Scaffold this active site. Structure first.
Site, PDB file in Angstrom:
ATOM      1  N   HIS A  83     -20.081  14.850  15.707  1.00  0.00           N
ATOM      2  CA  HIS A  83     -19.566  14.589  14.494  1.00  0.00           C
ATOM      3  C   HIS A  83     -20.042  14.094  14.242  1.00  0.00           C
ATOM      4  CE1 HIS A  83     -16.672  11.048  16.245  1.00  0.00           C
ATOM      5  NE2 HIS A  83     -16.396  11.399  14.321  1.00  0.00           N
ATOM      6  N   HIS A  85     -19.443  10.825  11.684  1.00  0.00           N
ATOM      7  CA  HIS A  85     -19.431   9.302  11.770  1.00  0.00           C
ATOM      8  C   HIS A  85     -20.045   8.283  12.544  1.00  0.00           C
ATOM      9  CE1 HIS A  85     -14.505  10.251  10.934  1.00  0.00           C
ATOM     10  NE2 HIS A  85     -15.047   9.907   9.765  1.00  0.00           N
ATOM     11  N   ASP A  87     -20.584   6.291  14.469  1.00  0.00           N
ATOM     12  CA  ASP A  87     -20.646   6.114  15.811  1.00  0.00           C
ATOM     13  C   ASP A  87     -20.544   6.970  16.982  1.00  0.00           C
ATOM     14  OD1 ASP A  87     -17.811   7.827  15.214  1.00  0.00           O
ATOM     15  OD2 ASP A  87     -16.863   6.501  16.905  1.00  0.00           O
ATOM     16  N   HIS A 148      -9.536  14.509  14.595  1.00  0.00           N
ATOM     17  CA  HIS A 148      -9.903  13.540  14.272  1.00  0.00           C
ATOM     18  C   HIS A 148     -11.258  14.270  12.299  1.00  0.00           C
ATOM     19  CE1 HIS A 148     -11.997   9.682  14.271  1.00  0.00           C
ATOM     20  NE2 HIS A 148     -12.945  10.412  14.198  1.00  0.00           N
ATOM     21  N   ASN A 179      -8.788   5.641  12.409  1.00  0.00           N
ATOM     22  CA  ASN A 179      -9.844   6.087  11.108  1.00  0.00           C
ATOM     23  C   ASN A 179      -8.957   7.832  11.320  1.00  0.00           C
ATOM     24  OD1 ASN A 179     -11.339   7.236   9.369  1.00  0.00           O
ATOM     25  ND2 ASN A 179     -12.987   6.714  10.269  1.00  0.00           N
TER      26      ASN A 179
HETATM   27  C1  LIG Z   1     -11.815   1.000  12.676  1.00  0.00           C
HETATM   28  C2  LIG Z   1     -13.135   2.116  11.516  1.00  0.00           C
HETATM   29  O1  LIG Z   1     -13.283   2.622  12.714  1.00  0.00           O
HETATM   30  P1  LIG Z   1     -14.286   4.420  12.745  1.00  0.00           P
HETATM   31  O2  LIG Z   1     -14.394   4.780  11.120  1.00  0.00           O
HETATM   32  O3  LIG Z   1     -15.543   3.470  12.903  1.00  0.00           O
HETATM   33  C3  LIG Z   1     -16.906   3.934  11.592  1.00  0.00           C
HETATM   34  C4  LIG Z   1     -18.080   4.648  12.411  1.00  0.00           C
HETATM   35  C5  LIG Z   1     -14.518   5.720  13.769  1.00  0.00           C
HETATM   36  C6  LIG Z   1     -15.151   6.376  13.770  1.00  0.00           C
HETATM   37  S1  LIG Z   1     -14.649   7.617  15.085  1.00  0.00           S
HETATM   38  C7  LIG Z   1     -15.108   4.147  15.580  1.00  0.00           C
HETATM   39  C8  LIG Z   1     -13.394   3.219  15.455  1.00  0.00           C
HETATM   40  C9  LIG Z   1     -12.183   4.246  16.277  1.00  0.00           C
HETATM   41  C10 LIG Z   1     -10.973   3.152  17.177  1.00  0.00           C
HETATM   42  C11 LIG Z   1      -9.718   3.081  16.685  1.00  0.00           C
HETATM   43  C12 LIG Z   1      -9.026   1.899  16.982  1.00  0.00           C
HETATM   44  C13 LIG Z   1      -9.424   1.494  18.633  1.00  0.00           C
HETATM   45  C14 LIG Z   1     -10.587   2.215  18.926  1.00  0.00           C
HETATM   46  C15 LIG Z   1     -11.327   3.042  18.038  1.00  0.00           C
HETATM   47 ZN   LIG Z   2     -14.809   9.648  14.211  1.00  0.00          ZN
HETATM   48 ZN   LIG Z   3     -15.153   7.831  17.004  1.00  0.00          ZN
END
Ligand SMILES: CCOP(=O)(OCC)[C@@H](CS)CCCc1ccccc1
Ligand SMILES: [Zn+2]
Ligand SMILES: [Zn+2]
Ligand SMILES: [Zn+2]
Length: 232
Positions: A83, A85, A87, A148, A179
């Protein structure tokens, strides 16, 4: 056994062999003052590798390619981002510079462009409708419906019974929603049910973040999503 947040400085990447020709990659990133682990997938196909998702940024994705070269030694020839985002696509430029052909659905490409995130070059066709599946080398790509994010894909490795749920699936240790700014909370449990119905034989289920498990992760995620839905 499986690498955790505590054991990976931001900037380093770990590989974890799940089966013959199947690995996860694990990285960490700082965001809003906390550190988060993140998974992707590596799947052998003959004498090359298919990569699922970046390691959350250019620096990490550079380390990822180096760690692949060190521990596996086969070239990454294609990559799929599941997707839009960062990551999942953060580091696509690094991959592309290294000669990797980068892929994502038209929906992911469109959303990445809107968001200002890196845009995989190639389009994955045949995945725009909930329940769509297509073959992609040694994996099957599946669009379960909005969860998600509206564009999230899952990845199945038939030879290994490995289901990569990406960020539509939560690890068991996460009991609150992460998120969900781009989530379809209303549809997410239904999309998870489509995953269950299409891949009931899955033995190893990998979330986008944290520890793998089995198909229970699906019900777990539904629990957490429904509890968030019921914010009081
Ligand atoms: C806290 C920010 O999360 P993100 O929006 O990172 C910006 C790319 C999210 C995208 S899937 C990745 C982190 C998700 C996560 C949250 C809590 C614990 C473990 C992973
Ligand atoms: Zn995401
Ligand atoms: Zn993620
Ligand atoms: Zn649970």
């Amino acid at each position: 056994e499986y690498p955790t947040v505590s054991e990976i400085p931001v900037g380093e990447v770990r590989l974890y062999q799940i089966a013959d020709g199947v690995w996860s990659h694990i990285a960490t990133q700082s965001f809003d003052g906390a550190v988060y682990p993140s998974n992707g997938l590596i799947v052998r196909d003959g004498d090359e590798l298919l990569l699922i998702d970046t390691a959350w940024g250019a620096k990490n994705t550079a380390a990822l390619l180096a760690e692949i070269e060190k521990q596996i030694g086969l070239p990454v020839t294609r990559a799929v981002s599941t997707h839009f985002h960062d990551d999942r696509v953060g580091g696509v430029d690094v991959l592309r510079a290294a000669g990797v052909a980068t892929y994502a659905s038209p929906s992911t490409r469109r959303l990445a462009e809107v968001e200002g995130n890196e845009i995989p070059t190639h389009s994955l066709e045949g995945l725009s409708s909930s329940g769509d599946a297509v073959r992609f080398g040694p994996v099957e790509l599946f669009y379960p419906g909005a969860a998600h994010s509206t564009d999230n894909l899952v990845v199945y490795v038939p030879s290994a019974s490995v289901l990569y749920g990406g960020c539509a699936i939560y690890e068991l240790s996460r009991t609150s929603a992460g998120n969900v700014a781009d989530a379809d909370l209303a549809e997410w449990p239904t999309s998870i049910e489509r995953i269950q119905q299409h891949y009931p034989e899955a033995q190893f289920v990998i979330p986008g973040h944290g520890l793998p498990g089995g198909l229970d992760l699906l019900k777990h995620t539904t629990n957490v999503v429904k509890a968030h839905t019921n914010r009081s």
